[PDB]
Amino acid sequence: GFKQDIATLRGDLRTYAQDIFLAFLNKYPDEKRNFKNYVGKSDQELKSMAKFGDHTEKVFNLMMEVADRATDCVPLASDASTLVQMKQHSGLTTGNFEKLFVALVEYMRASGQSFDSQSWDRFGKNLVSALSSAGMK
Amino acid sequence: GFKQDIATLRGDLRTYAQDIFLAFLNKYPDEKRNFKNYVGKSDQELKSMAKFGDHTEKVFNLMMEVADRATDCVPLASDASTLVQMKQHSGLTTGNFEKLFVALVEYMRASGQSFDSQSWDRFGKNLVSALSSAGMK
Ligand code: HEM
Ligand code: HEM
Ligand SMILES: Brc1ccc2[nH]ccc2c1
Ligand SMILES: Brc1ccc2[nH]ccc2c1
């Protein structure tokens, strides 16, 4: 279930973080505009960049912390506030987050592993609603 | 404290995993014998080797999960059994793990960060005891 999925993802954090982020960027090419350093590069080019690996590792680590602290797939309001108030998230809307979790669930369903994809979908939906309640457009 | 230390380490996972493993290998040169392809290399050369980066991250990812699942710095028996039953650990003894945690505690004390080094020392001793009860020589 959800808690085991967190353990599975944390066990190979960098590998999953890169694969999920690339799934997101390739499913929604327009989102790649938020990352000017990654424009014009193939998946294998990005995977060779130390900057890419470090960025995805840090984002995914915090996503796993938020998921681990959630109750019944409902994130803590304080975690949602943190994500809203981050300077790196100025200009972002809840739609950006919604698309990320669509790609994440689609990745889990296609991987063949026994991820609890329904729980991740609910978590994504509750996180979007918590970001709204925390002041994100 | 201990729980916050886990979060700190996970926040810069690749850096700490490599730094701590290198501190271990340089404090205990004999331990490089378990890693034949690491001999004759400086630290920066090791940090460029594919197997080194992948290995240290997977070790540290799982070590933080074991620490996170512990109660009062006592690991779960199931986590100890997992570490003992791993085919990669055949031929290892508790002494290899004891040396790892001496280096980790010394690293924390020399870092100037507010690590709860006393809790990590207890954790290491309690893990070693659990490994022995689970079957490791
Ligand atoms: C639960 C989901 C998310 C979490 C936990 C999260 C967390 C983070 C973290 C920790 C950083 C700092 C990373 C670093 O130091 O390189 C970061 C940066 C950033 N994030 Fe988020 N993020 C999330 C979702 C998103 C989404 C959906 C977008 C855009 C579609 C986004 C856009 C960015 C950008 C543009 C940066 C700055 C990257 C850079 O300057 O290189 N994040 N985020
Ligand atoms: C809390 C302590 C430890 C944890 C969680 C742990 C976990 C792991 C994991 C997950 C792997 C497989 C990762 C991979 O795919 O390479 C591994 C491999 C390995 N570990 Fe452990 N380990 C620990 C302690 C140690 C110690 C103390 C030693 C030796 C002094 C050691 C020696 C090895 C070796 C030789 C391998 C295989 C190397 C290879 O295949 O290239 N480990 N360990
Ligand atoms: Br997984 C993952 C990794 C890095 C990221 N950066 C922005 C969203 C995002 C998701
Ligand atoms: Br951190 C860390 C990373 C890799 C390792 N391999 C054997 C002990 C050890 C510790």
Residue numbers in the entry:
A (entry chain B), B (entry chain A): 1 to 137
The study reports:
Here, a high-throughput approach to determine room-temperature damage-free structures with excellent sample and time efficiency is demonstrated, allowing complexes to be characterized rapidly and without prohibitive sample requirements. We have applied this approach to crystals of two heme peroxidase enzymes: a multifunctional dehaloperoxidase from the marine annelid Amphitrite ornata and a dye-decolourizing peroxidase of industrial relevance from Streptomyces lividans (DtpAa). We also examine the challenging case of detecting nitrite binding to copper nitrite reductase from Achromobacter cycloclastes, where the ligand displaces a water molecule bound in the active site. Our results cover several different ligand-binding scenarios, such as coordinate-bond formation to a heme iron (imidazole) or copper (nitrite) and noncoordinate ligand binding in a pocket (DHP ligands), with the latter being highly relevant to the binding of ligands to pharmacologically important proteins such as cytochromes P450.
Strong electron-density peaks were present for the two Cl atoms of DCP and the single Br atom of 5BR, allowing the ligand orientation to be easily confirmed, although it is important to note that the electron density was well defined for all atoms of the ligands. For both DHP–ligand structures one monomer had near-full occupancy, but significantly lower occupancy was observed in the second monomer of the homodimer [Figs. 1(a) and 1(b)]. In this case, the lower occupancy of the two 5BR ligands was automatically found in Coot with a data set from 2000 images, but this step failed with 1000 images. A remarkable observation is that even in a data set comprising only 200 images (with 75.3% data completeness) the heavier Br atom of the ligand was clearly identified, with OMIT map peaks of 6.8σ (1.83 e− Å−3) in monomer B and 4.3σ (1.16 e− Å−3) in monomer A at its position. Strong positive density (a 32σ peak) is present where the Br atom of 5BR occupies a similar position to a Cl atom of DCP, consistent with the larger number of electrons on the Br atom. A negative feature is present over the second Cl atom of DCP, consistent with a C atom occupying a similar position in 5BR. Finally, a positive peak is present for the C5 atom of 5BR where no equivalent atom is present in DCP. For example, for the 5BR complex of DHP a subset of just 800 indexed images (∼1.5% of the total number of images in the full data set) was sufficient to correctly model the ligand using a careful strategy to preclude the possibility of model bias.
